[model samples]
Target: HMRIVFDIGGSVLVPENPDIDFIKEIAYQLTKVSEDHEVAVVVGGGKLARKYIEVAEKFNSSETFKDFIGIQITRANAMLLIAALREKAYPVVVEDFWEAWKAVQLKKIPVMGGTHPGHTTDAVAALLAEFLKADLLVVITNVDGVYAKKIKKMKPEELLEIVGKSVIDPLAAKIIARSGIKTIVIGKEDAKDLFRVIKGDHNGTTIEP
Candidate 1:
């Protein structure tokens, strides 16, 4: 009965050319989580983006063209997820953020790809979460939670929960910097709020500068 926004980072999904087995697991997890409420998802390009971007750029593709190619991959990922949950998911790929917003209002879950160039899908998901004032914004990443150093490299047993914003959010900003396109970033405050929800410690993290 509530609205939850999810940002499906490529990092969390099965690798490029993911085998059917892993894809099924992803579908299962998505279906399980989406059973509760209206969901809006922003799929990340991940390896798909880099791979195509490199190939296209080498062939003289414009930056805009490369971005669109990456967007298509994200959209394809979204489409596959939608197919997995036919009854729960909306059939169409929402290219427009406003359309995704409108669909959610109409009680339909929407999954979309990147909107513009020079921005990561992370920012895109945050933009939607902010605009909708989503009850919960879930960012499913390779890491269970954000941390100071890259947790991907951490030993399995050494991994720890990143409880606060002071740890890794500044690094996220650095990642966004490469896009060079400015967007509303849910800063430390938003990061804190998101973590709290994940930890079940509070309703939301109080975002602060």
Candidate 2:
């Protein structure tokens, strides 16, 4: 059984290259568990998407154009990861569901960019997870973990951990719907030590069946 891995990108991977050392460190950690486990990744547009969208809107660019900017950033991120992963990464960028399935069937690591506008990679990850029938889905967000309330303006230290899908899905659904992707968020609270820490049972937000 292979665990499908997904990374959500925001604006950080654009304009500037991601910290390669950090990503390589993760690769080292992932290698310990499975000598060559199948993996799939998705990058987020983050600030890069919105920044261009704002400028496009300023110029009265169509909403389609705004969405295109964000989606393009994700593809750029995907391509970057492709370069870093090299042979371990598959040659193709998956745009449709069947394409992803075929890639995984070959035990190839598939990388994808945003499908379209109006969505984040989070939702895309969920839909892909379901399609893959993956044993677990891990989300690496900027936050340490999901919190009970907005952390920035509020006391994040006092925030409770969001452990289950019930806590995370509603948020994922809205984003997924906009993407025209039928995915649901399910898994664990913290993602930093997913493959690195071996457990007898599944961990992370395991989306309920």
Candidate 3:
């Protein structure tokens, strides 16, 4: 079975007031997808994390400490998604690789957040994809795709083969190269597109290593 990792950002989670409809849609899609393939999700702390960080910065917290704060918020986000997924996903919000691997072994979608400092959820998702030896890593972002000089759509091969650095995440390429799995950068506007891509539609920017 194909293993897929979804990096869902907080903007998609809570652009404002926790979009219940969007959450339901995502849950529905993920449930259907997981029935056939092994699916894992990593949720990012977007504006919520930033808001908390602003307060923490006022206290002059270290970057690592701030990362811990961010990780908490991301895990909170992961909880929301887990609730949405219901029985379709693993009940626990995994914070370590060992637990994540176990959840995967059970064939349940293991949802998680940031693991360590200096790494964004994109990096977390990449690492999970690598650890799981996934077939595809789909990064759901606010934007459609990456741009070098301008906000133009580009391919994964274009990004890894030619354009490198600051494409998906700082650590994403390194993880992909090591893992050797195909990746995709897609927008959050169309939730259905995620399913389409999993069903073999070339809807997003594909990145291979």
Candidate 4:
């Protein structure tokens, strides 16, 4: 059985908050895939986290506090997907690696958010991929794919064979390289594109060691 880890951008779920319609569609796609593959999902804070962080910044909050707030927002986003997945996903948002592994054993899609203060969801996805020996790591973002450099504009159809460390979290790349996991960075316009990647029809930049 193949295993896949998804690093879902918070913006993809909603611009400023959790959008039910968007979560429903993503839930449907993830459920469809979970029937045949072991799937684990990680979500970022996106704009929601940023809004909270900005406010905290005004209050002279510590960076750790800002990160803690972001983690909470990501967990809240995880709840949306958990509700959407229903029985298809583990009920709780996993916080520990061993706990996450146990959730995987339950034969349900395990969903999570940020762990500690220093890492993003991309790092979380990478670590889980290593733990689960995942066959693929799919990172969904607002852009079409990973780029050689930050773009003024680019087409979704344009594919990059290999990209540098700038495109994804450096910690994530380190884990992926160490584990030899295959990675794909894709746009969030179409949730179905995730399925395409599962079918060996990736429509994004492939990061290789």
Candidate 5:
């Protein structure tokens, strides 16, 4: 079994409405995957984050403060997934790698969010994969993949340019480029598609080392 990290985008997770069905589906899939692989998940903040950030903007909060608002939203979302996963998941929204390392060692899938103010959840996932020496990082998002149009496969630098321009995000892209980690960017339309990615054949952008 290999180590794996999944970055589930918040917008896709909640959309403009609550989707408990989707959450449960993803939780089920993660549980299934965990049967064979060491797994950790990093949740994104998305629209809910924007809403909180807007409130911060109204008060003219510092940039880091606004980022803190976003981070909490991600953690809240992380909690929801953990709730769905029940006993299958590590109990807390892990605040750092030390917590995550312990969770993984306990053989429970660890759910997490943003690590620090300047870092996006995508970056957090990359760093998580790096820390755990994960074999793959699957970034599940709203879009089908990185498309400048439909790039089936790409070099890490190419991904950095595209993501620099959100194929993932600059920090995550840079980490993937340097670490030579295999990553797949796929849509969040279905949990089965996520399974396909774990199986090494997917209908999304493949970032090559």
Candidate 6:
């Protein structure tokens, strides 16, 4: 087992408010995954974040400050996931690049959200992969994944085009390109597929950049 990082979408995690059963099951699956692999996670804000963002827009100043509201909720989502992981997870939402590496060193799963305002949590996961020298980065999207006519393997450039149509943040594609990490984007239909992806049996779209 090698280092692995997951970029979990908030919509997937929360759906419609926090699903206790879903989060608990996901925690169990992640615990099972972490027995051998060094694991860390980054979560998004989803509907919750969107709701806050729209409200904050009424009071919007610099978009940067507005995004601070977005970032905080993602962190809150991280905190929620961590509550289930308990002792296995890092005690706090890691807010910087160095913190996740620290979590891996301690053999604890690091959970986090956005670091900078503009980059989505997808970018956070990719940059974390590059920083941690992770063997694989899995993006757990709300949708299944990108496909140019059912394409399984793709270049970063192609991924970017589809990112425009789909939900992936383009900055994520840019970082994946320059960092040249092994990454896959997959659906949250079954979190168990994360195990399959790691073990070389998954339906995720692969991107090597």
lDDT of each: 0.57, 0.55, 0.78, 0.78, 0.87, 0.84
**Alpha carbon lDDT at 147, candidate 5:** 86
**Tens-digit per-residue lDDT, 30-135, candidate 5:** 9888988898999998788899899999999999999999999999989999999999899989999878999999999999989798888999999999888889
lDDT of 6 by residue, 9-101 (tens): 889887879877878878888888999898989988888888888887887667897789999999999999999998999999999879888
lDDT of 2 by residue, 127-208 (tens): 7765666554555655433345432211211212232222333435443333333222212233334464334232322222
Report the number of the highest-lDDT candidate.
5
Best by TM-score: 5
> Candidate 3 residues 46-129, lDDT tens each?
888898888999999998999999989889888888999988789989987668889988988899989999888888889888
The TM-score measured for candidate 4 stands at: 0.88
Please, what is the TM-score per model? 0.67, 0.70, 0.89, 0.88, 0.95, 0.93
Ranking by TM-score: 5, 6, 3, 4, 2, 1
Q: How close is candidate 6 to the true structure, as a TM-score?
A: 0.93
Clash pairs, model 5 backbone:
163-167
Which has the higher TM-score value, candidate number 3 or candidate number 6?
6
Q: What does candidate 1's lDDT look like per residue over 139-198, in tens digits? A: 555443434333322221121133212322333344323322222222223333332343
Where does candidate 6 stray beyond 4 Å? none
**Candidate 4 lDDT, 58-121, residue by residue in tens:** 9999999999999999999898899999888999998877777888788888889999888888
Angstrom error of the Cα, residue 163, model 3: value is 7.2
Clashing pairs in 6: none
* Candidate 1 weakest lDDT stretch, 10 residues: 152-161
Error of 5 at 85 (Å): 0.6
Badly placed stretches (over 4 Å) of model 4 are 148-166
Who is ahead in TM-score, 3 or 4?
3
